Amino acid sequence: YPEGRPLFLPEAERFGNPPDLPSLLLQQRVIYISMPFLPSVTELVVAQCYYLDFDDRNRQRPIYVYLNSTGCINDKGQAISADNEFYAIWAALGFTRAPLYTGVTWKAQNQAAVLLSAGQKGHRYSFPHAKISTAPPVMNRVFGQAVDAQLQANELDYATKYYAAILARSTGKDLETCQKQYLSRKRYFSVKEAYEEGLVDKLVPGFMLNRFRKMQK
Amino acid sequence: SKKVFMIINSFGGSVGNGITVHDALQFIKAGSLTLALGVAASAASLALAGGTIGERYVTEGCHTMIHQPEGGLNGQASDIWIDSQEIMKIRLDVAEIYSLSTYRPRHKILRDLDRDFYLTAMETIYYGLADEIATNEVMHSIVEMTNQ
Amino acid sequence: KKVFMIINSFGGSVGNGITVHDALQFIKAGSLTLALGVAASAASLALAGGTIGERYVTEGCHTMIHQPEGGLNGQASDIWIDSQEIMKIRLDVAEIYSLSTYRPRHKILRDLDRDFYLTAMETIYYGLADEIA
Amino acid sequence: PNPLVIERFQGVVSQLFQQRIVRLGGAVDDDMANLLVAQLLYLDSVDNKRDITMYVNSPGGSVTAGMAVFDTMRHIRPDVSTCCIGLAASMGAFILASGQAGKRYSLPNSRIMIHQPLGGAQGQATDIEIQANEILHHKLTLNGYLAQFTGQSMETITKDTDRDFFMSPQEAIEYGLVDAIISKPQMLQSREV
Amino acid sequence: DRRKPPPPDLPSLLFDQRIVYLGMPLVPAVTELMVAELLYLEKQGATLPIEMLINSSGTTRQDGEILSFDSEGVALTSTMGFIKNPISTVNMGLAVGWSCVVLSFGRKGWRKSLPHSLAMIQQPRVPPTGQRQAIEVHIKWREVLDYKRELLRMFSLGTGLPVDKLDADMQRPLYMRPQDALEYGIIDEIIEPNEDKAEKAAQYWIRSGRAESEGRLEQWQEYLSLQEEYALKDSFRKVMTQDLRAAYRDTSSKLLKNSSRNMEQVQEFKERLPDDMLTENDEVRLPFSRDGVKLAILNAECYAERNIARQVAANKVSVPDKWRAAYAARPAPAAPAA
Amino acid sequence: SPVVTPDIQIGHGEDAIEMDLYRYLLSNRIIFIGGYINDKMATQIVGSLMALEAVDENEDIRIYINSPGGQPYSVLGVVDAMQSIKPDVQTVALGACYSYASLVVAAGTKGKRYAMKNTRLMMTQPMGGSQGDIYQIKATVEELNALYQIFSRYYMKFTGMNQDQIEQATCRDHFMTPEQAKLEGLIDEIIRGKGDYTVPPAIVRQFREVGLVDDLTPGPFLKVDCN
Amino acid sequence: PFGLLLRQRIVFLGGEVEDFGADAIISQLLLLDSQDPTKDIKIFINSPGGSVTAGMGIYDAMMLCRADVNTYCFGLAASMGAFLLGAGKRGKRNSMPNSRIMIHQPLGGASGQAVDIEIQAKEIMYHKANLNRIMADYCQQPLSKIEEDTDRDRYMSPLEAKEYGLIDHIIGGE
Amino acid sequence: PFGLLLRQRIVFLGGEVEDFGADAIISQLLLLDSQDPTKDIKIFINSPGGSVTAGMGIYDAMMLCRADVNTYCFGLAASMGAFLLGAGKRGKRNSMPNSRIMIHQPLGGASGQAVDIEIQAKEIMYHKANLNRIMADYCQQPLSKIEEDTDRDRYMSPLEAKEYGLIDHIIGGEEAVFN
Amino acid sequence: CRPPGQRQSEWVDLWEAYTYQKVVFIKEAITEDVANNMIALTLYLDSLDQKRIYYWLNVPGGDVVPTLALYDTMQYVRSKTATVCYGLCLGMGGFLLTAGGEKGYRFAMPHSILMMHHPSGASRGQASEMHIESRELVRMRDYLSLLTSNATGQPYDRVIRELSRNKWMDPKQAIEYGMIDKVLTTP
DSSP: OOOOOOOOOOTTSSOOOOOSSSHHHHTTTEEEESSSOTTTTHHHHHHHHHHHHTTTTOSSSOEEEEEEETTTOOOSSSSSSSSHHHHHHHHHTTTTOEEEEEEEEEEBBSHHHHTTTOOOOOEEEETTTTTTEEOOOOOOOOOOOHHHHHHHHHHHHHHHHHHHHHHHHHHHHHHHHHHTTTTTSSEEEHHHHHHHHSSOSSSOOOOHHHHHHHHOO | EEEEEOOOOOOOHHHHHHHHHHHTTTTTSSSSEEEEEEEETTHHHHHHHSOTTTOOOTTOOOOOEEEEEOOOOOOHHHHHHHHHHHHHHHHHHHHHHHHHSHHHHHHHHHSSSSEEEOOOHHHHHTTTOOEEEEOHHHHHHHHHHHHO | EEEEEEEEOOOOHHHHHHHHHHHTTOOOSSSSEEEEEEHHHHHHHHHSSTTTOOEOOOOSEEEEOOOOOOOOOOOOHHHHHHHHHHHHHHHHHHHHHHHHHHOHHHHHHHHHOOOOEOOTTTHHHHHHHOOOO | OOHHHHHHHHHHHHHTTTEEEEEEEEEEEEHHHHHHHHHHHHHHHHOOSSEEEEEEOOBBOOOOHHHHHHHHSSSSSSEEEEEEOEEEETTTTTHHHHHHOOEEOOOOOEEEEEEEOOOEEEEEEEHHHHHHHHEEEEEEEHHHHHHHOOOOOOHHHHHHHSSSSEEEEHHHHHHHSSSSEOOOOOOOOOOOO | OOOSSOOOHHHHHHHHTTEEOOOOOHHHHHHHHHHHHHHHHHHHHHHEEEEEEEETTTBBBBTTTSSOOTHHHHHHHHHHHOOOOOOEEEEEEEEGGGTHHHHHOOOOOEEEOOTTTTEOOOOOOOOOOOOOSSSHHHHHHHHHHHHHHHHHHHHHHHHHHHHHHHHHHHHOOOEEOOHHHHHTTSSSSSOOOOHHHHHHHHHHHHHSHHHHHHHHHHHHHHHHHHHHHHHHHHHHHHHHHHHHHHHHHHTTTTTOOOOOHHHHSSSSSSOOOSOOOOOSOOOOSSSSOOOOOSSOOSSSSTTTOOOOOOOOOOOOOOSSSOOOOSSSSOOOSOTOOO | OOOOOOOOOOOOOOOSSSOOHHHHHHHTTTTEEEBOOHHHHHHHHHHHHHHHHOOOOSSOEEEEESSSBBTTTHHHHHHHHHSSSSSSEEEEEEEEEEESSHHHHSSSSSTTTTESSSSSSEEEOEEEOOOOHHHHHHHHHHHHHHHHHHHHHHHHHHOOOOOHHHHHHHOOEEOOHHHHHHHHHHEEEOOOSSSOOOOHHHHHHHHHHTSSOSSSOSSOOOOOOOO | OOOOHTTEEEEEEOBBBBBHHHHHHHHHHHHHHOOSSSSSSSEEEEEEEEEHHHHHHHHHHTOOSOOOOOEEEEEEEEEEHHHHHHTSOOTOOOOOOTOOOEEEEOOOOSSEEEEEEEEHHHHHHHHHHHHHHTTTTTOOHHHHHHHHTSSSSSOOOHHHHHTTTOOOOOOOOO | OOHHHHHTTTEEEEEEHHHHHHHHHHHHHHHHHHHOOOSEEEEEEEEEEEHHHHHHHHHHHHHSSSSSSEEEEEEEEEEEEHHHHHSSSSSSSEEEOOOOOOOOOOOOOSSSSSHHHHHHHHHHHHHHHHHHHHHHHTTTHHHHHHOOOHTTEEEOOHHHHHHHTTTOTTTTSSSSSOO | OOOESSSSSSEEOOOHHHHTEEEEEESSSOHHHHHHHHHHHHHHHHHHOOOOOEEEEEEOOOOOOOHHHHHHHHHHHSOOOOEHHHEEOEEEEEEEEGOTTTTTOEEETOOOOEEOOOOOOOOSHHHHHHHHHHHHHHHHHHHHHHHHHHHHOOHHHHHHHTSSSSSEEEEHHHHHHOSSSOOOOOO
């Protein structure tokens, strides 16, 4: 009969620390993705941004998104998922009034890479030894007629048109420029030349080399 | 709590499960607000049509896939004739839901149900499966009414 | 005080039916055995192991009565030793039923030769139950 | 098993071609039906008047594989004498009923089993009702052909063909599957007085 | 509110409102919970109603997979007869096998169902024996006969139909519609949708204008035009086969035989005139079709495009290339070709 | 045959033993098509067509077809090789034909396309599967449109119908009886028995579409009103 | 191999008799009828069992032979060879003195629909009534003595098989 | 059968190209050249693919043949048969009027050590570079245009194969070719 | 045994409620993983108090090496033990009946199926190491027979001849053989 109201950081500091490691990250407004885009793991990330926009007091703290996944395309090349699952991710992440600080640990294979540039400009954090890859997506095993391959070609037509619209807003290029540079062939990007291209801006905050700390001593 | 909010994001399953979620949303006295994310398959678009008319929201990246349900099994000669009349009756049963909620004629539903028909965000509003394009404001009022 | 359990089993070894048989007589108080649906050979030992006068059965319940089954493979000598095992287990469960049905033992071995099924009517006549619930 | 049984079985089948006897054995498949079509047109070439004693012993098979076996017997010039040894199936007793009237024989301890053809349907919703029309095309033609062979009506055939129905050789004379029974005369057994 | 804790999850919330949810198929793991759920509600009062939701495929899967036996469905209906409180069951979607038997075993007058639910009854499935002996097959067939007669017994008390009627329809899997289950005896009334939701949805398409501005008027006109062209097509198919039967009766009138009076002596003696018999043979009268309707006016179609044929008269001796059969066939004055 | 298929052959002579069944039938200008039409047996039918071409250039080479389907390019190689030889080819349809074996019996010469009474024919659009990236999806739909445009004008040359009748028939799964395929122009002569003139249920449905049979007068046909 | 004895009117019922295994023997039984309908035909039985619908095709094909039928058991006759051992002509059925003879009801399986159990139980009862009539014919035994012995597995020596009626003379001496 | 075409010097290349099926065609090709070095050899190619190692041995066997060779394409020619199609003598290259021609690079898998990967990476590039410069000789095409057409995984109708330079003549008078 | 019970005021599981009541239940077979939980449970009850421990067995068989781990913990502890039989103890489970409680503390149900046989093993490879594992299986065979001879009072030469083959006992013969002490009645 009483309402189950949630508690936040100005209120739940007297109730102790959270017991489990995803619940420490949920209190710190940090979402760590260590799994590719499965239908089981996409339901929790929708409820996570729904919880962060549920009863937040200020609604202005930046949400840190750490991504480490293959997206929907595995290392062998086939599609373990489809590209329509990413449309539920960007529509739910960009709904909140809070800015989206995006970071990458190791890899972002053709679905997490377009989410890497989709964050707030001026705060794209990245590790200095990560790998970034932008390739056009593929489809799973579909057995149909001649008109069935045409409608599947229209689904990948909207995939390249939606992915280039995100890269045109991030990198500041045209619509046809991002299709020729990124979404044509399976290429890879390092950390240094991606800053000149416009994928990332800086490194992670508080980064310092252990050898550079010995030079200060 | 006079309105419920259920996010629809699934690849669909059997057509018998999509009938139950559509009949349950049209039975309760409270309002039913349905929002889709990703796609709406044959088991998911019945929950999209199961909501009340006026508050069916879809985003710009949202798609909609309508198709006839599959099935079939192995048996005797006359056993296949019984269930083939049932699949043709279920295909007419889902055509009654799409003709009532979207105000489309019955002969034009079965033409689009004959093949795997995909819809964009623009033509879903023009067909009648949804009401308007979702944005930030249509869901900002959702998360603030459920706090009290 | 009085234990009340639901009897429902369609399979299983009869060796586990002897474990639940002696556990029911270990209780000092009475026992209420109410069978529902199917009663296998492991389930009928718990049905007959209850107190006389409190074994209920429904109109649609059935009781499966059959001999023990086993799987034997190996050397020639231990098959003959295990052949006497399945024989005296079948003679043991005949003496378990004989304490309740008040029948001679040679007629129960003829019913234990093949599979024997009973409806709700002749279960009362054969003494596995008491009345119809 | 071992090919020595296959080599000694290949010899006695090769002697059956000299006595104008063909062999229908095992399940009716697509490859075995093509081996039996080519062996029927060759026996007509050496003589177009002598009959062919068809050996029928099959526990089942495909429906469209036996359809090529059926119509190739009605158009050839001599009649085909069909005999039932061991067991007849739904595609086996249809070969038994397709013989010439007055020359269909059987043994008194063989089993004649008839039912509707099996199968299945899988695919889209339009693929279900189309594939259901294929089995009903196989259901109505086998019931239409059996009404002309046995002489019975249409409604009494489908009331027995819809389920698995076994038949005795004593009742097959009264029903119309086989015409006569070939058997040796019995011994003069004395009664118990 | 402070002394009573809230329910932790969703099945505990429906348990507090006395609602039993059968959402899982009939496995032996779920049947031991339902005999513990119904026996617990009997100890809390034998007068309070029990809400029951049915959503399962029964003891077997819908594709034909055998996961359990039909005997666990017998023990589920035995607790419904042992209990002594009114039970209101609601069918939710699928109901195959023993799931509709517990739907029909509820109290008469409270059996509810959705308008688009699925109901089906069929014969129980039998697992294979694995090439055992001969005499065990007869005992296994007796196990089928005791379980089939027990299924017809529990199905007769819930509906009211006799045993011989219910056994013939159970040989084939017969699916039941919610409109068909009223006259069959499965349910008692149909759960209606919300009338407040129906009038608010109908008023929204008129005020917003989406029922006419998005091209619905041109497509609903084609639905009535295709139904008009389909009603014109079968009417032309019916008048052509009526002229074939009228020409068949005209050609049969030029016959001189006594085969019709032989069937009159062996049949009944009352109806010596053409009249009704109140049976299967409903003889239609096709020349008695003088309508004279002055409302069905013909359209703007001229029939002057019909060519002129030879118009061979009836008194001709020309016979086609056929086998000879004129043994007793005398030449008619209206048909000399016989 | 569930376990094994024995060698059903006959070779008998007063002095020497002859060959087996398929070798003797190949010497009499008769080719058999059985099983799945893959790339392996496609060289067997084309290679035997070139073997009997060098023997005689005027005798009619006969091909017996009994296959439930096959590879779409392997069944394409036997048609155009059959149309690029000197003598005429008499085709005989055996068993069933599922969208590829119905093409080779329609690819015979006019007046020599013989089908039996209980033969099943079928005509559909070719199938296929999508693979990977959009540069191969667009290559896939351009391949399925190429296979549909080639097989469209094959039936226009051998049957003489219109392209609208082919698109309405090959849209879904359409099974044709030889009595119906004789009207479409796929075959030339129907093979019957000793006065066998039974009506298949596809023509009873065709008689119901034109209005010759009703439910009151079913005639001497099979029952069809059990729908 | 076996071709040297096939010309000497000897057949071998070896291995498990399946639907194809029974087809090889009953095809040979009519070739020896076509070669000579006067000379004797000897059948050597060594089988561990088989189905009833395949082993019934060997009995009527053996009874179709107008000549004399000799049946000799070599080794094991488990539930199928014991029926064919007595099915020969009286005075010619023999067996080795150290062979095992097992008589049993014919095996069968039942699956599918519940209405198939109506049909599968009837063919078992028809095969039981058919085999018990034949086994009581050449053995000169009443029907009450046959049914109480074939209900379970029953191994027997050729000593008591002589007085039963399966064999006629012992060929191995004692 | 196949032996009747062998004495008339006509061989068949059917099915998937393997290592066991490679040397069977090479062993019978040198036997026809030793019997008659003046009579032409007609081949028939129907292959849905194959290995680049065993497929080059068929090309070296036709170059080792002193007599002229004639090719015929029926059925399929996918990434290995189209290379063996144009590799014959110019002016004696015929095919079916509806056969398909696929010009695409061969495939390959790589696994193992880090030094092991870069060896087979440049090996399949050297196989890609050698297959491009060999097929550009008998086609009379520039190298930059023929190296990008093999990257597109699209089949080729025999109508546009004639002016491309891969084939010379079409059996059927060049009117039966359907688009 | 899946629904839990109560100890005095809160919900505790059924096997752990008897752990506080100093009753040990063994229902599954003796494997390596369940023997790690049994010998850790014997040391836990020995550290709390010093009373008699009750063991109820349902072992249908098991391995040799984890069974000797549970046998040696019975003699190491300073408390007393008592083994009570219900159901069946087959293989090495019947040896644990004669582990402790020799002075009138071996009880059994009147329908318990007993089983005694020599242990077994399997280890292949080199022929030189086959001699070493054969010496280990021989030294495990006679040592398991020496403990059954001292607990039951049987001569050592009779256990080698009888338990090498298959041997089964009813509770009527288990009294005269010295394998059990008393038979449990109806109360």
